[PDB]
Amino acid sequence: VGECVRGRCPSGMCCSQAGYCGKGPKYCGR
Numbered sequence: 001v002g003e004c005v006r007g008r009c010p011s012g013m014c015c016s017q018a019g020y021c022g023k024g025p026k027y028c029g030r
Contacts, residue, residue, distance in 0.1 A: 001022060004015040014028035015021050 001010055001013055002020065004019050004021040007015060007019075009015055009021040013021050013023050016026050017030055021027065
């Protein structure tokens, strides 16, 4: 979160095209 940690995310978060992890349209969509 913030970064996708080595490409991973914490509990149910998603990874954006920018290598940044969070929850929302640009994270779980694109």
